[PDB]
């Protein structure tokens, strides 16, 4: 009749409402991320937010290198990423080590996945409150996204977008692949595919972007890594002799 | 409202305070009166014992914690002799292994750090006990105040108890007269029990009713009662 | 070293025991009990390192009392022999082995039969019309293979044991004080008080 | 392989009298053949009018006279400053040295 | 911390009983009903399943009735997922007991030490009790045939004739009504089914619906016999009694 | 039915954990402190209220130093602060025990940023009541970092906590604007002392006593030390002479 | 930091309701339709792909799964809590089987296992129960082929066929007038399809319904030859285009 | 890892828990024992609610702890089987290193002990049984009769009940039971034990077992005929007045 | 509900609070200090005339020269008795000496508030404080004749003259009045009996009171039966007599 809404059991509908609300908490930083899969490469894009004049606009970043292969954007309280961050970094060098080769995308979204579940079934444990989208160019697979959530559920992507307006971006990708048929982006280079992102950013959010704006990572075969703001300065002046 | 935030020491109220731990720091207020105070060559605790009946013993309100080290106790006297032992180890590995004194400003880092594991861990109580440490090392003579919350202060003088507020106003008025009693143990005990004095409102101070403690540069914590505090009266 | 004889007869089992403790040059004792009762129908002798031996043997004749008073019950000759085993059994591959060589002499009062085990401190089982732990059995197993017979009385259990005593206190090299004889049947375990001077 | 005693030299010499007592020790540290020092003291006075030395291992020796001078610090504050008798010291030094009954140390001590 | 959301499973009533043991006890009047009956040559162990479905398979299917030993058996009402974990820890207790002495567990000795297994999480350790009731049907050369109950309690008692689950109040009136010293197993049966028959919740009393056993010595054998009643087997004994 | 602020790790509907910002609340009733960074080190300064003439000036010192090279100063509760820093000192020499080199202010960042983060998972311990302001030198630049009691952490050009945090802020943004390319280390400390000054007049009733600290590549050899005598004098008496 | 959950969080209620193991049933009654069927010479499970966004790739998420060459599972209710059990159902295959008898363990015993991992979740100190429900197929060599469900409490039961989650209650009475004992695996799979086209109302083809058999040996799918002894998997799961064969004639 | 504080001091300083385990020894099942001058009788009823028990196998109400000393009790029956099992081990391990039995005394202060031990652990309910300790000690001809209860306090009685109706038992051994001269003989001893019983049981020809032990380890249990015979007797006292 | 070890507004431990309220449900004890022994004496209070008092043992040996008296829950006093005598015999084991009665009774209190769910320090195995106040009675070389009172909140204080449990106030305010720093043992003894008259429900006899001294020749004796009956005959003489 109250404590079912404080700790991880079951109300009398059936639902987990810690676990409810911790996808709440994944909206508190206001912040909307896209990714999408190219010939060769993953792309994710996150806006950037710097209110604070005082801040170090190169510290605030929601992307993370998570293995030479593998990389990271969260939706969600800087505190929970930067745990779920580390403890993805922990666990690909300990697969690397214990297994001899490097750990599959899909592979460590299920183990976060699984981890996310755990906290979602044992009583102490709180839920963290984000979301976690993992890219790489798998050398099995080929160009990867799996997103994992606090209800540690975790699926493979053509696309993907998260963050308050969502279901702007998601609505307008799948006009995209309607239109196009194929389920990814048809250009070989990942400086044309960076700028496709960031196009059908703007087509659905409805807004400009300069070069502090935005935060971006690339996946290719076996490299991932994060642009300047000089090279998306590079690649915003791309967009605006096209259109 | 407030019944909800009190319950254990892991809790927060809305205003950002620690219940538990205000309630400790009433333990304190609730003990009998005790003084501390110095100059740059000695240090001195003075303190107020209470009885039960005039069948009972007064309760000691001062312990040794090395040759060059104590304190004065006021609120729980379990909580202080936990305290007090645990600072007599420290005092203890500093010269077994270091063949060092310890410096009394770790002295209240070390109950300070203790004080704090127990105001952020679940199941256990803060400690209900406020400390008056004195002392004598390579920086010459000191004076601390401890509170249950961790907060440890360095001060020329302070007063803890019951009716303390009379005697910390003596102190601050009296400030550039007794830091200057060096070479002169006599005139500074003077100094502390015409400021206990100050804090009594009931009882007169009488022979097995008065506690006091010295220490300084040539001379080791030693405790005085009964009958060798009988010409302070 | 230490004699312990036992012979399972017609409606008894005897078990005679040397009455000497001896530690370096001298004989400590010569009126030794190397014997626990372990339940009135039930007894067990035994022989080995100094401590161990009666240690092991109180141990067991807790274990077996305790069971008792919890069953208001007594268990049979096999039972309790299949427990000695198992505590020897795990003996050897502990720290340090109960160095410990047992005989256990039980009347079962259910198959009403005599029954004598072996049990050596590796753990090793077995049931025999006689037997003998130590240097004993170099002379007994061979003067009882040619003097037994299974339908013996427990008279006849007594002049056999008495030929097996004369002959290992004419060739063993040590002095074992002579024996203390018990005969275990369906009335419980008395004490041949005479058989020292029989 | 590790040894993990050595030998120091040294002699200690003890005498009680009528209302007095004294302990006595040459002031010389050895190692085999080697002078390690000339004077280094061996007997040591412990609080409470008792008077100390452990010769032999003189890291053993260090280690006992440490140890049991604290044992007479921790007696007074925890029997009110009382005094530690001679016999009560005595008792004491035993249950210091066979608490180490399986990895002794190599000391002839006399108090 | 924690002590917010404690039920605290193992404390005492004001007027002095166990709620977590009445409560599980509450839980096992709704659960199908078992009977037990034990007479001069052999024992009965009769259950009721629940609700039942067309396509619950029947042959593989026995959820009731368990083997513990090859002389001792028990029929469950409550939990069978409860009932499984204890049912496991008998069978290994009857494997200590066979490894240390050479004989099978005596029946009462099996029946106490999940009892006291039982007992535990009535007194300490902060979990619930385990939502069962047994009913063991035994034998062995000191006591011969044997009926012991036990529930969630950790208490047990010994019978001549019992029933668990629901309505047990109805059934030992019922048993109280035509059970004799001098039975046989075959008289026995018939008791066990009318009894069944009387006291169900369902319209009639069919094969699917139920679990049947015997503990007998071999009619010639001289050694002692657990049947477990084939679906088939009981579909016969049902029109045998007269309920076709 | 409510009650969602009762317990640590507990998710409120909003998706807010309000032990967390309770905590929040012992560090805004705090004393003020602050960083400044400048174009090869860092600057830290602190409040120290002055509650009696019986405190010993100079002697209850709040910034604190974690190895060699790193400084720390916070606001709200004095002992947490103390604990975390214990903490800092532990997870440095560790770093430097398997790594040989000092630790990187980036990575001693962190590591208190998920030991904080830790004491918000938990109903069995309660969140930090301070934010840590701390910095200091490493092979490439200089870094200041602020640290919130939920584990949140970032980079500053300039920070502060605390009573006067807002009069602070203002006056670190004019900073920022009038020096684009960088302030000298000389320069950051006497303005240092004028921001402190200046957010005293929140506790304007009660006297206070000046600590500064600083950490810089040609002023310090990059190690962390204490501003004392004539250079505290120097930057005091710039606060007082621009107060008028 | 340390767990203080020692304590069960399931607990009988004066009415002898185990709480939380009733909710965890109305959990799986939200979840979707999933089912099983057996015939003589094989069984079959299946049940609706529900994807959460058209931007999602539903082959990356397998609701069926291989627990032993010989056994497959599927569930209905909260799929996370089912992939954690399909993690230790094949581990204690092999620790607490195959490790010991070198073969794998009989369907019963696996789902015994299974259930007993579940009921643990119903007692144990600090845990919820699992939100799921269980539909394991399987075939061993002394047993032939067998369906079990398996319940949030542990409990279990052997069907003939049976359905579960959302349309349970319409499927299973679908079910109970087509089933017989003289089915060939073939039929079981046409039954099959029909039962599921009753719960999905939207797209109904090989892309968005997960199915799988416990048949015959599979020789071409055990990735060897050499042994005589060894055959293949009799678990196939079915691919997108050998579903859509079977809904042209339907 | 379960340490929660179950038996704790209420606002006016009473332990709820020791309370209440009380509570379930006065449901139990009546428990009496009385002392002659060379003998001990423990009387007990049974229960009339459900009477198609198998009497040889159900659990009998006294138990022998040793050869020479009896337990009997009343409250939960399944708290009762751990503390008799312990005392069964103590009274074994006593024999193995004092070589001699326990005194009657000794085996109750352990009972006691651990009954005392469940009101201040963590983690754990009281006992809701209270027990009645009689015997012999070895060698020794007096008679030694013992109680104890939840919260661990012990003492000896010339003549003590327990349980359901324990008050008008006890009211009518108050009145009956003549410390100056004892019941002199084992006959004498045993019919006002079954009189007492008679106020409480109502007609229990099997419903109340008596049990006596004599000094020596000599301990036995009474039949339903031999207990009728008391009954019997008794019941034709009332009318020739 | 709320912790075992929680603290009040007012500033006191709840439990150690309550504690204090079942020793006054307890049975009164008294001790008097003099200079000839300390004497110590309690109300045994059997619920039943069927109780055999003397069985009640509510005065306990801890060594030969320190005794002990015990009001309260009396059953919560063993393992502080069997901690005492341990404490005491092992003194001597280390020291070949008596312990004083202060250290022995400091050891006591230390135990007191080793209760809780868990208190950072030290791991205190114990769900609540003990329900039992002490009176521990005993003579040593350098203090003498002593009287301690030792309760539940961990603190001891040395007394005079003290009475503990159900009549302690009544008690308290008449030994105030009595106690002088000359009394003889004998005047100790027969003013025990004086104030248990007064505070018992029952008329005071040789079995429904026990009376106990020690004294530095004897050790510490538990009067019988028999001696106790002609101190309460001789009592009752000297209060008809003025």
């Not at chain 7, 939200?30 to 069927?37: A, E, F, K, M, N």
């Not at chain 7, 909260?78 to 089987?97: E, F, I």
């Not at chain 7, 049976?162 to 087509?178: D, N, Q, W």
């Not at chain 8, 009762?80 to 006593?94: C, F, G």
Request: net charge negative; hydrophobic share 35%; glycine share 8%.
């Amino acid at each position: 009749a109250g404590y079912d809404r404080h700790i991880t059991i079951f109300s009398p509908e059936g639902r987990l409402y810690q676990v409810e609300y911790a996808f709440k908490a994944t909206n508190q930083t206001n912040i909307n991320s896209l990714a999408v899969r190219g010939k060769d490469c993953t792309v994710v894009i996150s806006q950037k937010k710097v209110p604070d004049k005082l801040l170090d606009p190169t510290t605030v970043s929601y992307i993370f290198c998570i293995s030479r292969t593998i990389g990271m954007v969260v939706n969600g309280p800087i505190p929970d990423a930067r745990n779920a961050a580390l403890r993805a970094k922990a666990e690909a060098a300990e697969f690397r080590y214990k297994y001899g080769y490097d750990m599959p995308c899909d592979v460590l979204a299920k183990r976060m996945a699984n981890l996310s579940q755990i906290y979602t079934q044992r009583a102490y444990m709180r839920p963290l409150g984000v979301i976690l989208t993992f890219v790489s160019v798998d050398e099995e697979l080929g160009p990867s996204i799996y997103k994992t959530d606090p209800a540690g559920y975790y699926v493979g992507y053509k696309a993907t977008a998260t963050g308050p307006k969502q279901q702007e971006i998601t609505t307008n990708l799948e006009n995209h692949f309607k239109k196009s048929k194929i389920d990814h982006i048809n250009e070989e280079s990942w400086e044309k595919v960076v700028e496709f992102a960031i196009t059908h950013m703007i087509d659905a959010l409805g807004t400009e972007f300069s070069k502090n704006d935005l935060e971006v990572g690339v996946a290719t075969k076996d490299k991932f890594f994060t642009l300047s703001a000089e090279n998306i300065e590079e690649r915003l002046v791309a967009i605006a002799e096209q259109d | 409202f407030r019944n909800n935030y009190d319950g254990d020491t892991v809790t927060f109220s809305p205003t950002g305070r620690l219940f538990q731990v205000e309630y400790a720091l009433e333990a304190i207020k609730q003990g009998s009166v005790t003084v501390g105070l110095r100059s740059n060559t000695h240090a001195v605790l003075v303190a107020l014992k209470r009885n039960a009946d005039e069948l009972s013993s007064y309760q000691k309100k001062i312990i040794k914690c090395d040759e060059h080290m104590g304190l004065s106790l006021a609120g729980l006297a379990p909580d202080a002799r936990v305290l007090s032992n645990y600072l007599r180890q420290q005092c203890n590995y500093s010269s077994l292994v270091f063949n060092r004194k310890l410096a009394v400003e770790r002295a209240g880092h070390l109950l300070c750090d203790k004080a704090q594991k127990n105001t952020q861990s679940y199941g256990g109580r803060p400690y209900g006990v406020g400390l008056l440490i004195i002392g004598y090392d390579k920086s010459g003579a000191h004076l601390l105040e401890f509170q249950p919350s961790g907060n440890v202060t360095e001060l020329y003088g302070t007063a803890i108890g019951a009716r303390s507020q009379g005697a910390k106003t003596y102190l601050e008025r009296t400030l550039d007269t007794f830091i200057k009693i060096d070479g002169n143990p006599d005139e500074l005990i003077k100094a502390g029990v015409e400021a206990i004095s100050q804090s009594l409102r009931d009882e007169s101070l009488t022979v097995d009713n008065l506690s006091i403690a010295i220490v300084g540069k040539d001379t080791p914590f030693t405790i005085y009662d009964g009958e060798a505090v009988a010409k302070y009266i | 070293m230490d004699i312990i004889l036992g012979i399972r007869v017609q409606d008894s089992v005897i078990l005679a025991s040397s009455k000497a403790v001896t530690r370096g040059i001298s004989v400590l004792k010569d009126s030794d009990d190397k014997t626990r009762q372990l339940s009135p129908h039930t007894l067990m002798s035994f022989a080995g390192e100094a401590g161990d031996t009666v240690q092991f043997a109180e141990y067991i004749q807790a274990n077996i009392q305790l069971y008792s008073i919890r069953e208001d019950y007594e268990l049979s000759p096999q039972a309790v022999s299949s427990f000695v085993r198992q505590e020897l059994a795990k003996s050897i591959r502990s720290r340090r082995p109960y160095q410990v060589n047992v005989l256990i002499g039980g009347y079962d009062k259910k198959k009403n039969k005599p029954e004598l085990y072996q049990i050596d401190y590796l753990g090793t089982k077995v049931e025999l019309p006689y037997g003998a732990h130590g240097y004993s059995g170099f002379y007994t197993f061979s003067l009882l293979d040619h003097h037994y017979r299974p339908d013996m009385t427990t008279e006849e259990g007594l002049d056999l044991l008495k030929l097996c005593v004369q002959e290992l206190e004419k060739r063993m090299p040590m002095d074992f004080k002579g024996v203390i004889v018990k005969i275990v049947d369906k009335d419980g375990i008395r004490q041949v008080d005479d058989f020292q001077a029989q | 392989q590790f040894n993990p005693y050595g030998d120091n030299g040294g002699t200690i010499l003890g005498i009680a009298g009528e209302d007095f007592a004294v302990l006595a020790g040459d002031t010389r540290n050895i190692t085999d053949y080697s002078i390690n020092s000339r004077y280094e003291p061996k007997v040591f006075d412990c609080g409470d009018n008792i008077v100390m030395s452990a010769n032999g291992f003189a890291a053993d020796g260090d280690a006992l006279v440490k140890r049991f001078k604290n044992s007479v610090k921790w007696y007074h504050f925890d029997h009110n400053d009382k005094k530690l008798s001679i016999n009560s010291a005595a008792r004491n030094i035993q249950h210091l040295l066979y608490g180490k009954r399986f990895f002794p140390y190599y000391v002839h001590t006399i108090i | 911390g924690s002590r917010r959301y404690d039920s605290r499973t193992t404390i005492f009533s004001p007027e002095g009983r166990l709620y977590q043991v009445e409560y599980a006890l509450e839980s096992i009047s709704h659960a199908g009903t078992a009977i037990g009956i034990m007479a001069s040559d052999g024992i009965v162990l009769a259950a009721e399943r629940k609700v039942t479905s067309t396509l619950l398979e029947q042959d593989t299917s026995t959820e009731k009735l368990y083997k513990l030993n090859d002389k001792i058996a028990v029929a469950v009402a409550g939990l069978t997922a409860d009932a499984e974990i204890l049912i496991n820890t008998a069978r290994i207790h009857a494997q200590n007991y066979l490894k240390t002495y050479n004989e099978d567990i005596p029946v009462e000795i099996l029946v106490r030490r999940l009892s006291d297994i039982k007992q535990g999480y009535t007194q300490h350790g902060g979990l619930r009790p385990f939502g069962v009731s047994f009913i063991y049907a035994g034998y062995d050369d000191r006591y011969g045939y044997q009926l012991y109950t036990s529930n969630p309690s950790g208490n047990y008692t010994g019978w001549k004739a019992i029933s668990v689950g629901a309505n047990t109040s109805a059934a030992q009136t019922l048993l109280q009504m035509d059970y004799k010293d001098d039975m046989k197993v075959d008289d026995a049966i018939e008791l066990a089914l009318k009894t069944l028959s009387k006291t169900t919740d369902s319209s009639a009393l069919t094969y699917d619906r139920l679990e049947f056993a015997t503990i007998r010595k071999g009619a010639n054998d001289g050694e002692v016999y657990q049947k477990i009643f084939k679906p088939q087997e009981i579909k016969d004994i049902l029109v045998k009694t007269g309920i076709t | 039915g409510t009650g969602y602020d009762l317990s640590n790790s507990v998710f409120s509907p909003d998706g807010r954990n309000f032990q967390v910002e309770y905590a929040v609340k012992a560090v805004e009733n705090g004393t003020t402190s602050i960083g400044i960074k400048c174009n090869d080190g860092v600057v830290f300064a602190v409040e120290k209220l002055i509650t009696s003439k019986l405190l010993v000036p100079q002697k209850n010192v709040k910034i604190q130093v974690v190895d060699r090279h790193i400084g720390c100063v916070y606001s709200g509760l004095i002992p947490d602060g103390r604990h975390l820093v214990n903490r800092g000192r532990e997870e440095a020499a560790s770093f430097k025990k398997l790594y040989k080199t000092p630790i990187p202010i980036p990575a001693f960042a962190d590591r208190l940023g998920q030991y904080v983060q830790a004491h918000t998972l938990y109903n069995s311990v309660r969140p930090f009541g301070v934010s840590t302001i701390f910095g200091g030198v490493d092979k490439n630049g200089a870094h200041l970092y602020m640290l919130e009691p939920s584990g949140s952490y970032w980079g500053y050009k300039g920070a502060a906590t605390g009573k006067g945090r807002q009069s602070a802020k203002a006056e670190l943004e004019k900073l920022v604007d009038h020096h684009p390319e960088g302030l000298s280390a000389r320069e950051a400390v006497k303005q240092a002392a004028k921001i402190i000054y200046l957010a005293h007049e929140d506790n304007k009733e009660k006297d206070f006593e000046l600590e500064i600290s600083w950490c810089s590549l040609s002023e310090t050899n990059g190690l962390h030390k204490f501003v004392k005598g004539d250079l505290l004098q120097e930057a005091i008496d710039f606060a007082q002479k621009e107060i008028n | 930091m340390t767990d203080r959950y020692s304590f069960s969080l399931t607990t009988f209620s004066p009415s002898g309701k185990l709480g939380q193991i009733d909710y965890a049933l109305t959990a799986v009654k939200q979840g979707v339709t999933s089912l099983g069927i057996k015939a003589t010479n094989g069984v079959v499970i299946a049940t609706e792909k529900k994807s959460s966004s058209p931007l999602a790739m539903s082959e990356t998420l397998s609701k069926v799964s291989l627990l032993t060459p010989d056994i497959g599972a599927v569930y209905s209710g909260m799929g996370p809590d089912y992939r954690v059990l399909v993690d230790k159902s094949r581990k204690v295959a092999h620790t607490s089987y195959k490790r010991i008898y070198g073969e794998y363990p009989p369907t019963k015993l696996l789902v015994s296992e299974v259930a007993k991992i579940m009921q643990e979740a119903t007692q144990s100190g600090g845990v919820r129960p699992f939100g799921v429900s269980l539909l394991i197929a399987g075939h061993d060599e002394f047993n032939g082929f067998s369906l079990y469900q398996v319940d949030p409490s542990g409990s279990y039961f052997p069907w003939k066929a049976t359905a579960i989650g959302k349309g349970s209650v319409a499927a299973k009475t679908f079910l109970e007038k087509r089933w017989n004992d003289e089915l060939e695996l073939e039929d079981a799979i046409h039954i099959a399809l029909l039962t599921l086209k009753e719960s999905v109302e939207g797209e109904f083809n090989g892309d968005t319904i997960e199915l799988a058999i416990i048949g015959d040996e599979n020789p071409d799918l055990l990735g060897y030859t050499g042994i005589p002894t060894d055959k293949g998997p009799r678990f196939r799961k079915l691919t997108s285009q050998e579903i859509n064969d079977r809904l042209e004639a339907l | 890892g379960y340490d929660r504080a179950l038996s704790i001091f209420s606002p006016d300083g009473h332990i709820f828990q020791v309370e209440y385990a009380l509570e379930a020894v006065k449901r139990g099942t009546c428990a009496v024992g009385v002392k002659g001058k060379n003998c001990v009788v423990l009387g007990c009823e049974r229960r009339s609610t459900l009477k198609l028990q198998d009497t040889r196998i159900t659990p009998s109400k006294v138990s022998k702890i040793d050869s020479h000393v009896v337990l009997s009790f009343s409250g939960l029956n399944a708290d009762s089987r751990i503390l008799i099992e312990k005392a069964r081990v103590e009274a074994q391990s006593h024999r193995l290193t004092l070589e001699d039995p326990v005194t009657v005394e000794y085996l109750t202060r352990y009972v006691a002990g651990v009954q005392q031990r469940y009101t201040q652990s963590g983690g754990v309910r009281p006992f809701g049984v209270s027990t009645l300790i009689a015997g012999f000690d070895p060698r020794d001809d007096e008679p030694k009769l013992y109680q104890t209860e939840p919260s661990g306090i012990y003492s000896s009685w010339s003549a003590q009940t327990i349980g359901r109706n324990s008050k008008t038992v006890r009211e009518f051994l108050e009145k009956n039971y003549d410390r100056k001269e004892p019941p002199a003989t084992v006959e004498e001893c045993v019919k006002l034990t079954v009189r007492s019983l008679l106020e409480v049981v109502q007609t229990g020809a099997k419903n109340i077992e008596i049990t006596v032990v004599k000094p020596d380890s000599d301990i036995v249990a009474l039949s339903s005929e031999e207990i009728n015979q008391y009954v019997t007797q008794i019941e034709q006292e009332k009318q020739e007045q | 509900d709320r912790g075992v070890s929680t603290f009040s507004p007012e500033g006191r431990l709840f439990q150690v609070e309550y504690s204090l309220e079942a020793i006054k449900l307890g049975s009164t004890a008294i001790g008097i200090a003099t200079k000839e022994g300390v004497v110590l004496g309690v109300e045994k209070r059997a619920t039943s005339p069927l109780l055999e008092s003397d069985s009640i043992e509510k005065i306990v040996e801890i060594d030969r020269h320190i005794g002990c008296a015990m009001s309260g829950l009396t059953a919560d006093a063993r393992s502080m008795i069997e901690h005492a005598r341990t404490a005491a015999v092992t003194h001597n084991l280390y020291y070949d000496e008596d312990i004083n009665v202060e250290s022995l009774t400091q050891s006591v209190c230390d135990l007191a508030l080793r209760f809780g769910e868990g208190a950072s320090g030290e791991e205190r195995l114990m769900s609540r404080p003990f329900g039992v106040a002490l009176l521990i009675a005993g003579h040593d070389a350098d203090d003498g004749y002593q009287l301690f009172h030792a309760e539940p909140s961990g603190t001891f204080y040395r007394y005079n003259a003290k009475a503990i449990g159900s009549g302690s106030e009544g008690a308290q305010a008449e030994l105030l009045n009595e106690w002088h720093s000359s009394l003889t043992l004998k005047e100790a003894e027969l003013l025990v009996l004086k104030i248990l008259k007064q505070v018992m429900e029952e008329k005071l006899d040789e079995n429904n009171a026990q009376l106990s001294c020690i004294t530095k020749q004897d050790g510490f004796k538990i009067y019988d039966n028999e001696k106790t009956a002609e101190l309460i005959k001789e009592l009752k003489e000297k209060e008809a007599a003025e």
